[PDB]
Amino acid sequence: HSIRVDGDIILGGLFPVHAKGERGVPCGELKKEKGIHRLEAMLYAIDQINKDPDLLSNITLGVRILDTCSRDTYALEQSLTFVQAKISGVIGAAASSVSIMVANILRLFKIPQISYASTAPELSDNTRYDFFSRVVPPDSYQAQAMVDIVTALGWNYVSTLASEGNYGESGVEAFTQISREIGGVSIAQSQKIPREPRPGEFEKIIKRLLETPNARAVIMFANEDDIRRILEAAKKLQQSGHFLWIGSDSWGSKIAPVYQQEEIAEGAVTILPKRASIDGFDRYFRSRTLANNRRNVWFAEFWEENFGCKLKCTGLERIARDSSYEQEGKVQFVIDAVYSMAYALHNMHKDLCPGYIGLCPRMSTIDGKELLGYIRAVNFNGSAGTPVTFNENGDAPGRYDIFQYQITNKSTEYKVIGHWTNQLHLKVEDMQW
Amino acid sequence: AHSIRVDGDIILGGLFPVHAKGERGVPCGELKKEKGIHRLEAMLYAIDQINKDPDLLSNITLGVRILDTCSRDTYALEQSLTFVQAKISGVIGAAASSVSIMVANILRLFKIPQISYASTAPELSDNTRYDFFSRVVPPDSYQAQAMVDIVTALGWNYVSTLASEGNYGESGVEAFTQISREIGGVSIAQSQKIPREPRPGEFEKIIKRLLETPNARAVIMFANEDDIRRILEAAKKLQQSGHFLWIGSDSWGSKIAPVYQQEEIAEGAVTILPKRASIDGFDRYFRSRTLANNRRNVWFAEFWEENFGCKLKCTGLERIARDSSYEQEGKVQFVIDAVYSMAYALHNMHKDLCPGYIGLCPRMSTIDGKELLGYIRAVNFNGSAGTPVTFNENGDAPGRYDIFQYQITNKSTEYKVIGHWTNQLHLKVEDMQWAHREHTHPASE
Ligand SMILES: *[C@@H]1O[C@H](CO)[C@@H](O)[C@H](O)[C@H]1NC(C)=O
Numbered sequence: 024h025s026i027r028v029d030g031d032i033i034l035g036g037l038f039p040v041h042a043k044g045e046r047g048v049p050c051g052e053l054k055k056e057k058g059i060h061r062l063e064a065m066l067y068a069i070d071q072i073n074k075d076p077d078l079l080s081n082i083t084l085g086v087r088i089l090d091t092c093s094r095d096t097y098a099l100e101q102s103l104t105f106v107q108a109k110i111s112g113v114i115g116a117a118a119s120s121v122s123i124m125v126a127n128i129l130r131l132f133k134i135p136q137i138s139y140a141s142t143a144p145e146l147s148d149n150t151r152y153d154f155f156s157r158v159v160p161p162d163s164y165q166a167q168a169m170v171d172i173v174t175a176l177g178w179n180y181v182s183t184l185a186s187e188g189n190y191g192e193s194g195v196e197a198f199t200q201i202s203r204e205i206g207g208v209s210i211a212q213s214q215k216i217p218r219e220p221r222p223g224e225f226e227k228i229i230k231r232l233l234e235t236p237n238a239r240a241v242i243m244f245a246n247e248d249d250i251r252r253i254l255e256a257a258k259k260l261q262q263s264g265h266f267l268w269i270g271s272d273s274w275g276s277k278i279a280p281v282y283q284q285e286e287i288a289e290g291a292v293t294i295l296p297k298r299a300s301i302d303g304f305d306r307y308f309r310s311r312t313l314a315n316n317r318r319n320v321w322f323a324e325f326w327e328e329n330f331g332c333k334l335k336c337t338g339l340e341r342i343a344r345d346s347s348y349e350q351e352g353k354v355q356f357v358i359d360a361v362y363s364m365a366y367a368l369h370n371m372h373k374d375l376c377p378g379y380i381g382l383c384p385r386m387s388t389i390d391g392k393e394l395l396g397y398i399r400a401v402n403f404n405g406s407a408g409t410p411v412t413f414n415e416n417g418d419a420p421g422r423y424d425i426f427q428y429q430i431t432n433k434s435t436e437y438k439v440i441g442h443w444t445n446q447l448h449l450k451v452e453d454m455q456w
Numbered sequence: 457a458h459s460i461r462v463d464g465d466i467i468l469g470g471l472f473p474v475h476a477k478g479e480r481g482v483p484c485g486e487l488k489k490e491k492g493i494h495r496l497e498a499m500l501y502a503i504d505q506i507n508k509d510p511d512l513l514s515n516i517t518l519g520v521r522i523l524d525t526c527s528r529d530t531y532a533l534e535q536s537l538t539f540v541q542a543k544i545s546g547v548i549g550a551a552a553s554s555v556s557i558m559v560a561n562i563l564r565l566f567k568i569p570q571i572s573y574a575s576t577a578p579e580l581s582d583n584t585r586y587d588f589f590s591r592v593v594p595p596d597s598y599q600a601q602a603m604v605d606i607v608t609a610l611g612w613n614y615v616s617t618l619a620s621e622g623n624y625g626e627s628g629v630e631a632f633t634q635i636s637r638e639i640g641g642v643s644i645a646q647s648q649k650i651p652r653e654p655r656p657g658e659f660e661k662i663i664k665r666l667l668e669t670p671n672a673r674a675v676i677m678f679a680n681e682d683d684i685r686r687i688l689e690a691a692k693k694l695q696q697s698g699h700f701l702w703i704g705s706d707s708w709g710s711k712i713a714p715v716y717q718q719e720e721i722a723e724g725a726v727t728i729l730p731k732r733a734s735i736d737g738f739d740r741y742f743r744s745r746t747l748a749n750n751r752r753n754v755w756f757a758e759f760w761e762e763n764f765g766c767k768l769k770c771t772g773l774e775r776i777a778r779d780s781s782y783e784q785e786g787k788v789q790f791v792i793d794a795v796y797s798m799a800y801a802l803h804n805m806h807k808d809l810c811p812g813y814i815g816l817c818p819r820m821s822t823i824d825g826k827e828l829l830g831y832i833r834a835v836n837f838n839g840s841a842g843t844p845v846t847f848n849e850n851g852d853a854p855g856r857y858d859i860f861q862y863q864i865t866n867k868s869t870e871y872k873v874i875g876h877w878t879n880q881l882h883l884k885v886e887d888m889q890w891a892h893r894e895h896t897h898p899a900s901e
């Protein structure tokens with residue numbers, strides 16, 4: 024029920040391999056992009072570190088990767104395997120509410136944590152989450168970027184849509200706070216999507232948004248699956264062209280919310296932290312087969328869901344050839360989160376074991392508080408050549424790329440229309456409606 | 457010693473806010489005389505009365521492991537680890553909702569039933585997130601509805617909301633906001649939040665933010681003891697007596713802590729509290745407590761110094777209610793009834809598992825958490841005040857409240873019972889008194 028890899032130093036991992044189940048079910052449908060891609064990015068990163076002769080010489084990094092199932096309660100059970108009083112550090116989680124609950128226990132046993140996706144402003148508080156760090160910026164900057172985008176387009180009358188939980192509510196709250204302080208932004212209504220929605224709830228939300236027909240723009244902090252079902256309801260009610268979607272990093276440039284629903288999502292403006300597609304991971308992931316990828320205990324489930332068969336399956340399918348494949352947006356952030364942990368251990372080794380290849384007797388047990396100090400201090404170029412750094416709160420700088428979902432003929436893409444680095448740089452020329 | 461250990465056949469865990477949260481990061485601060493000591497000592501009292509009894513849990517002694525939460529959920533999580541390893545069969549507490557929630561997260565994994573005496577957050581009713589949680593106090597769903605009715609009855613259709621950072625404050629105000637949005641003509645001017653770790657001058661800044669809507673004089677308040685005190689302190693400092701019309705939740709209740717030495721600024725404040733009565737039995741027990749006989753309570757020496765204003769200066773011959781002012785804390789009844797609920801459930805479980813034996817039989821050697829929870833939800837007994845104690849499917853008490861108003865006659869201050877809320881409002885407007893306005897705020901909106 025987990026991925027175990029032996030090594031000198033063991034790194035913990037938390038990934039949403041499955042979505043949350045319906046009503047009273049813990050785990051649901053497997054996430055191909057948000058789950059497998061990101062999980063496999065950690066294993067790839069560790070493979071690359073272990074291969075290297077310069078970084079952590081004569082030292083093998085081990086793995087303990089667990090499934091969160093998108094639930095914070097389920098992830099809490101899993102996180103108990105990291106503690107008993109050996110896990111030196113933990114990578115994850117993805118969802119903020121999941122990362123918050125895990126951070127609560129990890130700080131008691133002094134285990135450093137680096138997230139690749141969690142953006143909730145609460146997590147930057149060192150009094151509550153001292154052992155938490157992240158390679159993504161807090162939602163404070165993303166909310167401000169949204170207010171700037173809304174201002175630039177002249178949409179002074181907007182509506183907010185949020186998933187229940189920390190990420191959704193805190194994202195919208197920050198947007199509401201900043202818009203109240205500035206002039207020309209007014210909110211028509213706030214809609215909240217429940218954790219366990221009753222049948223027909225998403226259709227009611229669209230109907231509620233249609234109570235204010237002049238509020239066409241909808242700023243939304245909703246999770247991957249919630250956006251899809253919102254767009255699904257809007258498609259059924261023929262609301263194509265009416266709404267003007269503003270999506271957060273949970274939307275980003277993902278394929279999951281827009282698959283088979285391209286027309287309804289046309290013109291949607293989305294935000295995602297600065298990232299690039301990693302070529303090395305693409306070469307690795309495309310060459311994965313049922314035979315060579317036995318480490319991944321969830322890879323057989325992925326195979327069935329990815330190629331649309333049952334182990335019907337020939338067994339000799341190819342990931343990029345037999346099915347459409349594009350690297351998940353936050354794959355870079357996963358790899359950089361692993362390298363952040365690795366460089367910190369490397370810098371700790373350089374001080375505890377001077378001129379000693381391998382782990383010296385002094386570095387038999389890695390001190391958590393000391394390791395946290397090294398993580399917050401690292402400064403290196405990541406998997407894309409971009410610098411990776413942490414501030415006093417363990418945050419990355421507020422740097423984003425602004426996309427827009429555009430169709431030319433029958434080809435779909437998230438085209439870069441701007442970037443936000445303290446100030447908005449929106450290219451109005453490149454936008455399409 | 458950092459905890460209260462009392463040995464027995466069946467050990468019951470306890471979580472109490474003996475100390476308040478320290479300033480800016482500091483885990484523990486000032487000792488709570490009423491919220492901490494009164495309630496903690498109420499559990500020890502209840503257990504003494506159960507152990508003495510020949511009919512309830514015959515030939516069986518209830519043990520104790522009581523811990524301090526320091527009003528912090530992070531601190532309480534560290535303490536709650538002592539309850540688990542791979543024996544504690546029941547937990548009483550906590551007080552704060554956010555504290556109870558964080559403890560309930562770990563307790564359900566090791567299947568330990570939990571009964572709270574104070575925690576009122578609506579989220580705790582969910583048997584998906586917190587199936588092993590129960591409470592002898594009603595959820596804030598009812599209290600917020602009660603507050604709406606009071607506001608409707610008084611004609612205050614333009615209100616502001618004030619909340620402490622955390623589950624109790626935020627979701628208490630949210631419940632009030634959601635009801636106001638769905639039905640009625642009650643409008644909300646602004647929603648303010650009190651920071652968990654406030655900087656110097658924060659409470660004066662909050663009062664000044666509330667003045668940014670001068671028409672909204674009425675303030676719905678879901679804040680803890682310490683926050684209410686400092687809010688009223690800032691209002692006195694900024695000379696705002698008569699202006700604000702406070703609507704306080706059970707965290708305000710009929711408590712002395714926020715109004716002590718600040719009687720004038722709190723005049724006219726309307727407060728809510730679940731139905732309760734003062735128990736004479738506990739008063740007789742708590743008054744006769746000395747430094748010599750109460751060695752069980754490891755925090756009693758600290759309480760002594762704080763209660764009489766001396767240093768262990770102290771004669772040693774001081775007496776509770778005689779040398780210092782004393783009144784039983786409002787939620788003492790709920791602590792005792794929470795302990796008795798755990799006792800009656802174990803009694804009812806004993807009756808099915810050991811139908812003949814008097815005392816722990818071989819089948820009662822290990823207490824199953826899932827089994828005990830079923831008995832806790834099924835108990836039906838009259839409590840320490842004669843009031844019936846029941847639990848619904850979600851493990852909640854019915855929504856039954858009393859409404860108070862803080863009134864000053866001449867040289868006497870009290871919380872006068874001005875009404876009650878039991879599914880519907882019964883408010884006596886004739887018995888209400890108001891403070892004189894010293895400062896007026898003109899509006900231009
Ligand atoms: C790696 O470690 C092993 C065992 O400690 C040792 O025998 C070997 O010489 C080391 N390799 C290098 C290149 O130092």
Ligand SMILES: *[C@@H]1O[C@H](CO)[C@@H](O)[C@H](O)[C@H]1NC(C)=O
Pocket residue numbers: 515814815
């Ligand atoms: C109480 O328990 C003890 C020890 O098991 C036993 O000897 C005694 O008889 C019991 N008392 C009664 C009244 O049954």
Ligand SMILES: N[C@@H](CCC(=O)O)C(=O)O
Pocket residue numbers: 057117118119120140141142143190272273353
């Ligand atoms: N930024 C989101 C995570 C969304 C994702 O996994 O892309 C959160 O903090 O919950």
Ligand SMILES: N[C@@H](CCC(=O)O)C(=O)O
Pocket residue numbers: 491551552553554574575576577624706707787
């Ligand atoms: N009702 C408050 C507890 C206040 C008290 O202890 O009086 C809460 O749920 O946090």
